UniProtKB/Swiss-Prot annotation:
Gene assigned in the entry: LYZ
Classification via InterPro entries: Glyco_hydro_22 (IPR001916), Glyco_hydro_22_CS (IPR019799), Glyco_hydro_22_lys (IPR000974), Lysozyme-like_dom_sf (IPR023346)
Enzyme kind, highest EC tier: hydrolase
Gene3D superfamilies: 1.10.530.10
Principal subcellular localization: secreted
GO cellular component: cytoplasm; endoplasmic reticulum; extracellular space
Residue sites binding substrate per the record: D101
GO biological process, one term: killing of cells of another organism
Catalysed reaction equations from the record: Hydrolysis of (1->4)-beta-linkages between N-acetylmuramic acid and N-acetyl-D-glucosamine residues in a peptidoglycan and between N-acetyl-D-glucosamine residues in chitodextrins
Cysteine disulfide links: C6-C127, C30-C115, C64-C80, C76-C94
UniProt-recorded name of the protein: Lysozyme C
Stated role: Lysozymes have primarily a bacteriolytic function; those in tissues and body fluids are associated with the monocyte-macrophage system and enhance the activity of immunoagents. Has bacteriolytic activity against M.luteus.
UniProt keyword DNA damage present: no
Organism name: Gallus gallus (Chicken)
Cellular localization per UniProt: Secreted
Length: 129
């Protein structure tokens, strides 16, 4: 499913992401735009042979199981395909473990490069939340 900016902001909010660990809603929306262009079906393989999955491009090296990443740790205890669903619930639960892990949102390279230190509030402007 290709989400709308506001529809996604509202689902993320509903899912407990606003200010989760101190990151405002706009941070989360900004990261999804740049990670997956708001497409829950986005996948991208990396050089190390691991793959990024879903709206938040969660990596198969540590977070999920895809059966073809040697040395996967499966920290979120889920199959990576679950992350490609129209229901953002598993991506969200998994992201909350990631963000709590030490480097915060820096774990997300597009966040770090494209959202971080920007007026991220722009991402939820105009939205009925």
């Amino acid at each position: 499913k290709v989400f709308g900016r506001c529809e996604l902001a509202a689902a993320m909010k509903r899912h407990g992401l606003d200010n989760y660990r101190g990151y405002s809603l706009g941070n989360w929306v900004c990261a999804a735009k740049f990670e997956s262009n708001f497409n829950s079906q986005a996948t991208n393989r990396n050089t190390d042979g691991s793959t990024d999955y879903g709206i938040l491009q969660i990596n198969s090296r540590w977070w999920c199981n895809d059966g073809r990443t040697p040395g996967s740790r499966n920290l979120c205890n889920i199959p990576c395909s679950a992350l490609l669903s129209s229901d953002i619930t598993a991506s969200v639960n998994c992201a909350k473990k990631i963000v709590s892990d030490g480097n915060g949102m820096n774990a997300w390279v597009a966040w770090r490069n494209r959202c971080k230190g920007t007026d991220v509030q722009a991402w939820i402007r105009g939205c009925r939340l």
